[PDB]
Amino acid sequence: RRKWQKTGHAVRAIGRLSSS
Amino acid sequence: ADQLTDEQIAEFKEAFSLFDKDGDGTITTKELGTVMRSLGQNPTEAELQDMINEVDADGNGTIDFPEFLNLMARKMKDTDSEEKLKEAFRVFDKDGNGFISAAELRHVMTNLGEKLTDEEVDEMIREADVDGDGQVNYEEFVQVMMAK
Ligand SMILES: [Ca+2]
Ligand SMILES: [Ca+2]
Ligand SMILES: [Ca+2]
Ligand SMILES: [Ca+2]
């Protein structure tokens, strides 16, 4: 359930770590 | 903001598990690097260490769950969020035609280690497919990703 969201959280974490 | 419900914490814990391959509770440069490359990125060792240092509150060289949780709980400004949502869209949009198809979604999830059936992916595409064109654009992408 909400596998798309779980997956999205990971991808988003990478973007936040890259810090622009 | 950090007024996370247990349901949200559990969801973030599962996302953490995609990185934490050996399940020891910490993310190393090796693990972070593996995930980024399966997504098409090519980071250097220094870049990986620098990324970990950003959230390494205890200085142990790795990212544990509490640190990952704080990273995800952080609220950022609009001009930051928009750009980051766009960067995220680009990851799934493999062929870069401005849309996300079933194949591309399945591809990113498969590389991440998740086992999806052919039906599950098509079910997901239809839930987010508002305008009914079989694919998912940026607006539909933002709605599904940031849901809850
Ligand atoms: Ca680990
Ligand atoms: Ca740490
Ligand atoms: Ca596409
Ligand atoms: Ca659509």
mmCIF file of C-alpha atoms and ligand atoms in Angstrom:
data_model
loop_
_atom_site.group_PDB
_atom_site.id
_atom_site.type_symbol
_atom_site.label_atom_id
_atom_site.label_comp_id
_atom_site.label_asym_id
_atom_site.label_seq_id
_atom_site.Cartn_x
_atom_site.Cartn_y
_atom_site.Cartn_z
ATOM 1 C CA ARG A 1 0.000 0.000 0.000
ATOM 2 C CA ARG A 2 1.265 3.463 -0.960
ATOM 3 C CA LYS A 3 4.341 1.886 -2.579
ATOM 4 C CA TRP A 4 4.556 4.875 -4.930
ATOM 5 C CA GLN A 5 4.785 7.208 -1.939
ATOM 6 C CA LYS A 6 7.378 5.052 -0.120
ATOM 7 C CA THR A 7 9.448 5.045 -3.322
ATOM 8 C CA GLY A 8 8.937 8.785 -3.636
ATOM 9 C CA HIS A 9 10.228 9.408 -0.122
ATOM 10 C CA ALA A 10 13.540 7.747 -1.039
ATOM 11 C CA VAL A 11 13.970 9.772 -4.225
ATOM 12 C CA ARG A 12 13.031 12.942 -2.318
ATOM 13 C CA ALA A 13 15.580 12.160 0.402
ATOM 14 C CA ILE A 14 18.325 12.095 -2.236
ATOM 15 C CA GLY A 15 17.204 15.510 -3.489
ATOM 16 C CA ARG A 16 17.237 16.926 0.035
ATOM 17 C CA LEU A 17 20.722 15.530 0.684
ATOM 18 C CA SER A 18 22.029 16.995 -2.584
ATOM 19 C CA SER A 19 20.842 20.332 -1.153
ATOM 20 C CA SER A 20 20.461 21.938 -4.609
ATOM 21 C CA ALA B 1 7.305 20.291 10.678
ATOM 22 C CA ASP B 2 7.687 17.389 13.063
ATOM 23 C CA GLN B 3 4.297 16.333 14.376
ATOM 24 C CA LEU B 4 4.644 13.012 12.619
ATOM 25 C CA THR B 5 2.068 10.340 13.250
ATOM 26 C CA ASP B 6 3.210 6.752 13.878
ATOM 27 C CA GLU B 7 1.765 5.922 10.454
ATOM 28 C CA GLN B 8 4.057 8.474 8.790
ATOM 29 C CA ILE B 9 7.094 7.318 10.777
ATOM 30 C CA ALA B 10 6.486 3.708 9.705
ATOM 31 C CA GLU B 11 6.205 4.849 6.089
ATOM 32 C CA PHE B 12 9.536 6.685 6.317
ATOM 33 C CA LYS B 13 11.092 3.617 7.987
ATOM 34 C CA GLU B 14 10.174 1.534 4.931
ATOM 35 C CA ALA B 15 11.741 4.173 2.667
ATOM 36 C CA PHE B 16 14.859 4.012 4.859
ATOM 37 C CA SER B 17 14.963 0.234 4.298
ATOM 38 C CA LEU B 18 15.461 0.725 0.565
ATOM 39 C CA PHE B 19 18.799 2.358 1.401
ATOM 40 C CA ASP B 20 19.732 0.202 4.379
ATOM 41 C CA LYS B 21 20.431 -2.985 2.402
ATOM 42 C CA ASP B 22 22.028 -5.001 5.205
ATOM 43 C CA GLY B 23 19.393 -3.820 7.670
ATOM 44 C CA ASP B 24 21.886 -2.737 10.336
ATOM 45 C CA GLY B 25 20.044 0.542 10.959
ATOM 46 C CA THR B 26 22.565 2.887 9.286
ATOM 47 C CA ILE B 27 23.159 4.148 5.752
ATOM 48 C CA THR B 28 26.789 4.161 4.596
ATOM 49 C CA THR B 29 28.327 5.865 1.556
ATOM 50 C CA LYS B 30 28.323 2.435 -0.100
ATOM 51 C CA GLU B 31 24.563 1.988 0.336
ATOM 52 C CA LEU B 32 23.684 5.556 -0.596
ATOM 53 C CA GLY B 33 25.919 5.265 -3.647
ATOM 54 C CA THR B 34 24.297 2.003 -4.754
ATOM 55 C CA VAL B 35 20.796 3.483 -4.707
ATOM 56 C CA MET B 36 21.790 6.691 -6.535
ATOM 57 C CA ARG B 37 23.482 4.736 -9.317
ATOM 58 C CA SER B 38 20.525 2.387 -9.848
ATOM 59 C CA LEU B 39 18.603 5.644 -10.390
ATOM 60 C CA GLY B 40 21.065 6.778 -13.052
ATOM 61 C CA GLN B 41 23.209 9.112 -10.925
ATOM 62 C CA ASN B 42 27.022 9.056 -10.749
ATOM 63 C CA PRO B 43 28.299 10.485 -7.422
ATOM 64 C CA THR B 44 31.920 10.555 -6.229
ATOM 65 C CA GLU B 45 33.002 9.236 -2.820
ATOM 66 C CA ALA B 46 33.566 12.804 -1.602
ATOM 67 C CA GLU B 47 30.068 13.838 -2.702
ATOM 68 C CA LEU B 48 28.558 10.874 -0.836
ATOM 69 C CA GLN B 49 30.468 11.710 2.375
ATOM 70 C CA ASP B 50 29.477 15.376 2.018
ATOM 71 C CA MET B 51 25.821 14.351 1.686
ATOM 72 C CA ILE B 52 26.022 12.214 4.836
ATOM 73 C CA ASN B 53 27.793 15.025 6.742
ATOM 74 C CA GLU B 54 24.820 17.313 6.107
ATOM 75 C CA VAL B 55 22.590 15.297 8.441
ATOM 76 C CA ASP B 56 25.193 13.457 10.553
ATOM 77 C CA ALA B 57 24.144 14.898 13.935
ATOM 78 C CA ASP B 58 26.234 12.435 15.970
ATOM 79 C CA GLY B 59 29.352 12.500 13.752
ATOM 80 C CA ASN B 60 29.607 8.720 13.218
ATOM 81 C CA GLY B 61 29.985 8.936 9.444
ATOM 82 C CA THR B 62 26.640 7.272 8.647
ATOM 83 C CA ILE B 63 22.926 8.154 8.559
ATOM 84 C CA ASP B 64 20.667 6.399 11.083
ATOM 85 C CA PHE B 65 16.855 6.457 11.219
ATOM 86 C CA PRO B 66 16.492 9.430 13.614
ATOM 87 C CA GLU B 67 18.674 11.566 11.291
ATOM 88 C CA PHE B 68 16.781 10.435 8.168
ATOM 89 C CA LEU B 69 13.488 11.206 9.935
ATOM 90 C CA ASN B 70 14.647 14.753 10.740
ATOM 91 C CA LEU B 71 15.772 15.178 7.136
ATOM 92 C CA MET B 72 12.299 14.193 5.914
ATOM 93 C CA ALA B 73 10.490 16.167 8.621
ATOM 94 C CA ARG B 74 12.185 19.440 7.605
ATOM 95 C CA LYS B 75 10.010 22.043 5.918
ATOM 96 C CA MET B 76 11.550 24.054 3.080
ATOM 97 C CA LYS B 77 10.723 27.202 1.103
ATOM 98 C CA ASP B 78 8.622 27.239 -2.080
ATOM 99 C CA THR B 79 11.457 27.959 -4.531
ATOM 100 C CA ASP B 80 13.284 24.978 -3.008
ATOM 101 C CA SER B 81 10.296 22.614 -3.019
ATOM 102 C CA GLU B 82 9.345 23.351 -6.634
ATOM 103 C CA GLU B 83 12.877 22.698 -7.902
ATOM 104 C CA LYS B 84 13.200 19.536 -5.806
ATOM 105 C CA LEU B 85 9.814 18.251 -7.032
ATOM 106 C CA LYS B 86 11.024 18.888 -10.589
ATOM 107 C CA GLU B 87 14.302 17.051 -9.986
ATOM 108 C CA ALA B 88 12.273 14.132 -8.596
ATOM 109 C CA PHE B 89 10.000 14.081 -11.660
ATOM 110 C CA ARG B 90 13.071 13.911 -13.916
ATOM 111 C CA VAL B 91 14.200 10.683 -12.203
ATOM 112 C CA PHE B 92 11.051 8.750 -13.161
ATOM 113 C CA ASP B 93 10.686 10.442 -16.561
ATOM 114 C CA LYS B 94 13.430 8.317 -18.135
ATOM 115 C CA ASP B 95 12.956 9.305 -21.799
ATOM 116 C CA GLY B 96 12.295 12.877 -20.694
ATOM 117 C CA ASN B 97 9.144 13.397 -22.768
ATOM 118 C CA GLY B 98 7.449 15.232 -19.892
ATOM 119 C CA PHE B 99 5.325 12.254 -18.819
ATOM 120 C CA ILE B 100 5.659 9.179 -16.589
ATOM 121 C CA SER B 101 4.468 5.888 -18.077
ATOM 122 C CA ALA B 102 3.795 2.507 -16.486
ATOM 123 C CA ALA B 103 7.079 1.147 -17.841
ATOM 124 C CA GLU B 104 9.150 3.983 -16.358
ATOM 125 C CA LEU B 105 7.452 3.764 -12.955
ATOM 126 C CA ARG B 106 7.965 -0.015 -12.909
ATOM 127 C CA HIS B 107 11.587 0.478 -13.944
ATOM 128 C CA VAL B 108 12.432 2.832 -11.072
ATOM 129 C CA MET B 109 10.679 0.605 -8.528
ATOM 130 C CA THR B 110 12.372 -2.553 -9.856
ATOM 131 C CA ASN B 111 15.834 -0.964 -9.666
ATOM 132 C CA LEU B 112 15.054 0.096 -6.089
ATOM 133 C CA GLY B 113 14.486 -3.560 -5.212
ATOM 134 C CA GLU B 114 10.683 -3.640 -5.047
ATOM 135 C CA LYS B 115 8.791 -6.490 -6.689
ATOM 136 C CA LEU B 116 5.743 -5.175 -8.538
ATOM 137 C CA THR B 117 3.243 -7.179 -10.560
ATOM 138 C CA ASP B 118 2.110 -5.931 -13.968
ATOM 139 C CA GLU B 119 -1.331 -5.179 -12.516
ATOM 140 C CA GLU B 120 -0.100 -3.183 -9.488
ATOM 141 C CA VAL B 121 1.736 -0.682 -11.686
ATOM 142 C CA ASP B 122 -1.242 -0.211 -14.026
ATOM 143 C CA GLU B 123 -3.514 0.275 -11.005
ATOM 144 C CA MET B 124 -1.193 3.009 -9.709
ATOM 145 C CA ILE B 125 -1.076 4.747 -13.090
ATOM 146 C CA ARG B 126 -4.875 4.947 -13.273
ATOM 147 C CA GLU B 127 -5.284 6.387 -9.772
ATOM 148 C CA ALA B 128 -2.988 9.333 -10.614
ATOM 149 C CA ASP B 129 -4.114 9.666 -14.250
ATOM 150 C CA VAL B 130 -6.584 12.532 -13.847
ATOM 151 C CA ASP B 131 -6.907 13.779 -17.448
ATOM 152 C CA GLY B 132 -7.098 10.153 -18.611
ATOM 153 C CA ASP B 133 -4.258 10.028 -21.160
ATOM 154 C CA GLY B 134 -2.715 6.830 -19.789
ATOM 155 C CA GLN B 135 0.335 8.664 -18.455
ATOM 156 C CA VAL B 136 1.241 10.938 -15.533
ATOM 157 C CA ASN B 137 2.334 14.570 -15.947
ATOM 158 C CA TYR B 138 3.901 16.966 -13.417
ATOM 159 C CA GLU B 139 0.643 18.097 -11.743
ATOM 160 C CA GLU B 140 -0.551 14.525 -11.211
ATOM 161 C CA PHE B 141 2.969 13.624 -10.083
ATOM 162 C CA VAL B 142 3.002 16.324 -7.384
ATOM 163 C CA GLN B 143 -0.408 15.181 -6.098
ATOM 164 C CA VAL B 144 0.518 11.512 -5.697
ATOM 165 C CA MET B 145 4.049 12.084 -4.324
ATOM 166 C CA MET B 146 3.108 14.666 -1.678
ATOM 167 C CA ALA B 147 -0.121 12.890 -0.666
ATOM 168 C CA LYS B 148 -0.315 12.751 3.153
HETATM 169 CA CA CA C 1 23.283 -0.342 6.395
HETATM 170 CA CA CA C 2 25.005 9.536 12.237
HETATM 171 CA CA CA C 3 8.344 9.488 -20.181
HETATM 172 CA CA CA C 4 -2.394 12.007 -17.164
#
